[PDB]
Amino acid sequence: EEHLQMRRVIEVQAATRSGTHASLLTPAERTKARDFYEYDRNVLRFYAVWEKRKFRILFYLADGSIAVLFDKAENDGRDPYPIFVSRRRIPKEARAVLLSPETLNQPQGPPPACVRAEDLRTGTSVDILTRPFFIYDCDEHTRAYMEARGIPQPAVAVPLCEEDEI
Amino acid sequence: ALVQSNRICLSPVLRDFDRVRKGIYEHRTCTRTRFARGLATQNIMLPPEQLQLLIRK
Amino acid sequence: SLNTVLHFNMDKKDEDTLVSLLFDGIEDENGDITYKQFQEFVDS
Amino acid sequence: MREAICIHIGQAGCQVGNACWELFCLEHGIQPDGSMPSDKCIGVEDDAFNTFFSETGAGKHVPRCLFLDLEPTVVDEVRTGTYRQLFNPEQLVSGKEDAANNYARGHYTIGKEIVDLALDRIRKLADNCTGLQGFMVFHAVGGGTGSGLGALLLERLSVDYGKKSKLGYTVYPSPQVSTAVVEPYNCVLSTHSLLEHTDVATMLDNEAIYDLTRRSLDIERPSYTNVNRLIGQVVSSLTASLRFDGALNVDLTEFQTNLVPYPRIHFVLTSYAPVVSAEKAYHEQLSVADITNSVFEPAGMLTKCDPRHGKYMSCCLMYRGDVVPKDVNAAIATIKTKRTIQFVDWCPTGFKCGINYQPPTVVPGGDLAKVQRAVCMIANSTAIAEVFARIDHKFDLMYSKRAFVHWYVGEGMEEGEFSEAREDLAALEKDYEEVGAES
Amino acid sequence: MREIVSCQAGQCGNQIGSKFWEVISDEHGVDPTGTYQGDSDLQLERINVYFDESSGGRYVPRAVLMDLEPGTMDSVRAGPYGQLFRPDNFIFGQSGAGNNWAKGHYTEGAELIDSVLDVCRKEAESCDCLQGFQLSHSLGGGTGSGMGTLLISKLREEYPDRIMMTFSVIPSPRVSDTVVEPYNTTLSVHQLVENSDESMCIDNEALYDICFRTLKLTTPTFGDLNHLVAAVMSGVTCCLRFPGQLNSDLRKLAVNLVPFPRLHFFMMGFAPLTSRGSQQYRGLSVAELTQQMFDAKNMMQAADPRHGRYLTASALFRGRMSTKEVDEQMLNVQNKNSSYFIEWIPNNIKSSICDIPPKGLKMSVTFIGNNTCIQEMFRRVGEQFTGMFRRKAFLHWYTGEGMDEMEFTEAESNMNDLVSEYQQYQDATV
Amino acid sequence: REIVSCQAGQCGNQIGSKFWEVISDEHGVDPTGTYQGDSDLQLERINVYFDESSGGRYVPRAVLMDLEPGTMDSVRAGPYGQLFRPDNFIFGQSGAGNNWAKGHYTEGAELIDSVLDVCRKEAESCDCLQGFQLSHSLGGGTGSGMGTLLISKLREEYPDRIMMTFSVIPSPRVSDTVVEPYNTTLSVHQLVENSDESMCIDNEALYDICFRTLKLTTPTFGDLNHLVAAVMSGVTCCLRFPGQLNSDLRKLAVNLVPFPRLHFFMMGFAPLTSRGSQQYRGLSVAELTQQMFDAKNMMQAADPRHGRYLTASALFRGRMSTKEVDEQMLNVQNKNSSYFIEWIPNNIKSSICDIPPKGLKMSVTFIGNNTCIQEMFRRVGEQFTGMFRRKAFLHWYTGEGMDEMEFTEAESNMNDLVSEYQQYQDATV
Ligand SMILES: Nc1nc2c(ncn2[C@@H]2O[C@H](COP(=O)(O)OP(=O)(O)OP(=O)(O)O)[C@@H](O)[C@H]2O)c(=O)[nH]1
Ligand SMILES: Nc1nc2c(ncn2[C@@H]2O[C@H](COP(=O)(O)OP(=O)(O)O)[C@@H](O)[C@H]2O)c(=O)[nH]1
Ligand SMILES: Nc1nc2c(ncn2[C@@H]2O[C@H](COP(=O)(O)OP(=O)(O)O)[C@@H](O)[C@H]2O)c(=O)[nH]1
């Protein structure tokens, strides 16, 4: 790991000296390259609720990132901007999103666990930035994908929202 | 049916894709990407499943 | 503090009622409450 | 919020618009029926299509485009094509008679009876929009409609919309391979609006596209469809900065004031890379530095103007994909180190970069191979003087003998405005020479 | 108690402040949702410095967000701590500045700055005894610089006695990604001089070099690039929010680092900055902190510090360290680098101690430097400004937005006299 | 003690229906009339607005009035329409016709007799009235005409009793009629003499409240009526509930009316934050004071910064302190002495009610006798003079029985009142 990082850093130094680019790739961008080539434009959509507000959780297979988009109700009173959490890899622990001021990278040990497709299930509350999003339903593509993975995604009754109360 | 309706000739574009970039005059075979190339250049929009079935056959 | 700072100095029953008004169902196993719960009680 | 209105003029404009709109539909996940898949999610931002598509209460997405052609062939082809349900029945204007490669016909005879309803459709689109950034007019100045009706329409837009941004994507006549004989007349007459009423003018001549697709796309026989696909890819790359989020998002004015130094200097070179086929893509390490070098090479240009023959003035590079912010810095640094190209002395910086996190999309069976990242350079440079001199000498050889002049004159345009166009081009050449001259 | 209200201007300023507030929320134990989850009373002791309490037991930053493009506004609001800010503090225009200083300062910024000042005045009135306005912007842009300077000037007019701290990201020729950095920077430097008690310069070139060589990172985006400036901004006001052996406020820093009113431009540094593989191999001590802090290559703005002389310096150490080992180290650097300092100003270095280091650090330090080498960057961008101005290129855009031709010459003259002041005080002798 | 209310026209009837829904919610009364309030203080003073029958059903002391029988059916069939007494719905066969002439002289005259009959019945049922209330709009026909007729008759019959009017003042940006200059001109001059206190509401400012503060995408007249009904309830909060510093309608009238002809107030209410904003807004009395003086917060479409405050009233609700209630008024007076009047220092009265509104912690209603009301009055006077210069639209009034001298007297009263406001705005010690 650290040996690979040393190889990469001196390769970058040599590239700067010779006016060229690093030929081979870090394993991380190798994995992202296969993920982009296999699962581009393939996104899992989950319908969830948090604090009586409807949200769409989009899980990107190409990167493992999650984006939360707010769904409005007429005369809800909220701002009309849908994006709640932008596309990024959301760690299980909220504090893990922010990095050590020494290193500016991930902690020394193994990379931290992040919210995944197995984590995202209907009828359960996934913790996203210390917000329990209770996923109640998913679209047909995501349901088929999860069923093929082997975890079922039964639709459940939607919890109470602002639309019911207004 | 689309061919006799629109006077479709995929032979020249397919031939050019067979002999493109290649010093081989003719191999009588071409890649799936270049087959889709020929269909698109002839403007035959087809579903991806239909195209996959055709190239598989 | 209910007697040192808040100057209540009422009877035992009133003191117990005051404590219960803040420390039932919103206290951990150590009897502590968070600023969260304190301000929720204040603004309830 | 953050809308942009497209206006397609002429055959070239209509076909370029067809390519651009199929590309936009499959970038935003909108079927030709004009709806959403409702079973799968592409993952594109929900407000991304607001710049090109207007919502409807039933879920329809109506493009913010006005097709305007004086003859019904291409417009009826659009009306009966795959995207018949996507486009509005209106804002699809087909005239009763074409301009016949006569800028005079397209500007004075049949343009006056059509620009009124064209402006009506434009103002309807603007009223529908709420944060209109500007107008993008796609046409070929070498034809009749795109020259005459285009010049009239840009004049009217400039009059009735103040200083709103305009992007004139124009297919100029190429130095050698040109399809029309009065095309020099049309271009020289229509450049009046381009000098004045065009806010940024973009060259998309056909020889450069043909040459690029000859040895980059690995296909022996591309055509106008492939040319329009490349043009649409360039348009999408340019507009993605305001379409989607990115590391350095820019807007029309952002690469306007950062690219146009003088009011008469707004013509800009264009290029796009990595423009590769399926066989090419999997074998090339398409890094940011590699793609930037391929962009700055003079074979990978979408305008037939040799950059080495001129002085680079200001280049803005729109990157899409996983471009880390300092890959572009490394590419710019190696560009400065390598001496093949040279900038003008009074523009030391001369560089812009705008990065988007959205990777480019590929139309099925289309030109581009599905690549992680790409970059398009829009570059103001003094090399445009070469193509302007080419078209001007082309025009003089015909105007000296007064050939084809009567076709323009007889409908009701005068003759002195041919000369007026002549010294307009002369002044353009002179100001290019002056700005390229060292201090 | 003492409050610092923040103003993010432009895309760069918004991006920097977005995670500056993230770091501050870490240090004060603020949950992303807004609620207070701290486990120590020190987090809540001075949480009112940067946050105003709400009715739900949470805290909202005293941050005013400014830009003429809604896209970066959505980007900053979509962050993990983007929900922390008050929605009414998001003040934006429909039409962007187009990266034009004239448009951002006279046409659109002028119209939107009324609401901006309304929100700023509301925040100031909410603050019981406000101490300073900190602003984050970039001089290379249009709305960050043009509208930011107008906000700075009118805020100085409204609050003459307060501290107008500014964090300006200065462009560099090797990183320049626009053609009007010289124009915008020249038009903004005079405003900063006349309306800022202290301006602090940031260079993307120096940031990239620090990431490449010291941090040794391969391809990280603007996130950890701004992490350094966010950490430095958090550390500037450390003694305000946490107790220390030698407390210091922003006025103390200004009086200790601004010998003359025109000289308030400061170069930045942070320490320690260690790569991932070398974390366990580095013994964090005050001596090595001093060495890294005064190291030429560790400075956060891309100007050579050993070419000029240090007028004044400030070190804000955080953690539990002894005091002579932090002041005798400063004595040592003066003694072995007396040629790098100025003789007629003895005791060049402020040293301040704060008992609470950043979360995850044994001990740290932020460095502020009023070196006479900022004039090198000033001349570097002024030469470009003169080169463009002689040929009047890219000037019609500025003229058509209402700005006159004489103001460019006035900005050039002010910038030249500032450079002259720096040079004469560098070469001044007893 | 008790207050008897009247609703005139469609606007007045809908405003009153929303007000009665708000009062029933506050006092814990279902539309069926029976009581389920969990607090004793609601039943302690439930009799001010409601009268209980023999069976215990609480019926409001409300009299409904509209020449057109259209809105009567709507308010009756509404969610709380069963509350009102069936014989308190007095209506005619022919509509108001959007004409003050036949709303005040011909059609309303033959029905004002029964209106006064039912008002007399309500007054006799009451021990002795604290006052009359009238909710109406001056831009309409029956809201203006027979409403002002009722005000005049109650002025003549009950001289010492208070009459408070909630009048909807038209604005050009909202104007959905062409004769509202005539109607307002012919109505507010009557309101000057026959009303003890009048309170102006403008739909432009009501809509701006949902534009900016509540940021409601499709706010309806129901939402606007709720916004005004918060005020409608909060005016009598001290009468209906105990507090540290009690007040009533005459309390406010005495502290707010320095001269008999200046009783036109502009209204505000400042626990108004959107659902998104309330998550971050830290509710406090100082912030309530800050919001209650905001120009855009006022529900009357005139900028208070352009005039000077004669008097102001701050009806605070919710068990709070008294320092930050009064010392905050002192702060605003000291820091905006230019906005206030020098010869009346301490223009602001405060009152405290212990019971807060349901679902809230603290609240405040703002009464302002500012000199910016004459701006509305002079603009409507200019519109009236423009209409009257060419005698346009006057033939309907003349055919119904109006004469030119009465319009001239109305505009003379307009100029007199505008000058009266101006000569105190520019007055110096
Ligand atoms: N790049 C590109 N250019 C095109 C395309 N189609 C037409 N053109 C341009 O159009 C020019 C000829 O114009 P015309 O054939 O007269 O078409 P027009 O402008 O509509 O004029 P009319 O013949 O009257 O209809 C050629 O020189 C091309 O450059 C296209 O699909 N792609
Ligand atoms: N460190 C850092 N610099 C940035 C960031 N965003 C932009 N910049 C710098 O700011 C300059 C462009 O400024 P810009 O964002 O256009 O300013 P604005 O138009 O006023 O918002 C570029 O040269 C970048 O180097 C960021 O997130 N972090
Ligand atoms: N705030 C509010 N205003 C209303 C309502 N209904 C009508 N209006 C206003 O009243 C004015 C018309 O008054 P109108 O109903 O014709 O009076 P009428 O003829 O006497 O019944 C319009 O300008 C509306 O703005 C309502 O429910 N709420």
TrEMBL record, chain A:
Coiled coil: none annotated. It is found in: Cytoplasm, Cytoskeleton, Flagellum axoneme. One of its GO terms (molecular function) is alpha-tubulin binding. Residues 40-150 form the DM10 domain. One of its GO terms (biological process) is cilium-dependent cell motility. Keywords: Calcium, Cell projection, Cilium, Cytoplasm, Cytoskeleton, Flagellum, Repeat. One of its GO terms (cellular component) is mitotic spindle. Its main location: cytoplasm. This is Rib72 protein-like protein. The chain holds residues 210 to 375 of 741 of the full protein.
UniProtKB/TrEMBL annotation, chain B:
It comes from the Eukaryota. This is EF-hand domain-containing protein. It comes from Leishmania tarentolae. The lineage of its organism: Eukaryota, Discoba, Euglenozoa, Kinetoplastea, Metakinetoplastina.
TrEMBL record, chain C:
It comes from the Eukaryota. It is found in: Cell projection, Cilium; Cytoplasm, Cytoskeleton. Microtubule inner protein (MIP) part of the dynein-decorated doublet microtubules (DMTs) in cilia axoneme, which is required for motile cilia beating. This is EF-hand domain-containing family member C2. The chain holds residues 727 to 770 of 774 of the full protein.
From TrEMBL, chain D:
One of its GO terms (cellular component) is microtubule. Residues 248-393 form the Tubulin/FtsZ 2-layer sandwich domain. GO terms for molecular function: GTP binding; hydrolase activity; structural constituent of cytoskeleton. It catalyses: GTP + H2O = GDP + phosphate + H(+). Tubulin is the major constituent of microtubules, a cylinder consisting of laterally associated linear protofilaments composed of alpha- and beta-tubulin heterodimers. Microtubules grow by the addition of GTP-tubulin dimers to the microtubule end, where a stabilizing cap forms. Below the cap, tubulin dimers are in GDP-bound state, owing to GTPase activity of alpha-tubulin. Dimer of alpha and beta chains. A typical microtubule is a hollow water-filled tube with an outer diameter of 25 nm and an inner diameter of 15 nM. Alpha-beta heterodimers associate head-to-tail to form protofilaments running lengthwise along the microtubule wall with the beta-tubulin subunit facing the microtubule plus end conferring a structural polarity. Microtubules usually have 13 protofilaments but different protofilament numbers can be found in some organisms and specialized cells. This is Tubulin alpha chain. It comes from Leishmania tarentolae. The lineage of its organism: Eukaryota, Discoba, Euglenozoa, Kinetoplastea, Metakinetoplastina.
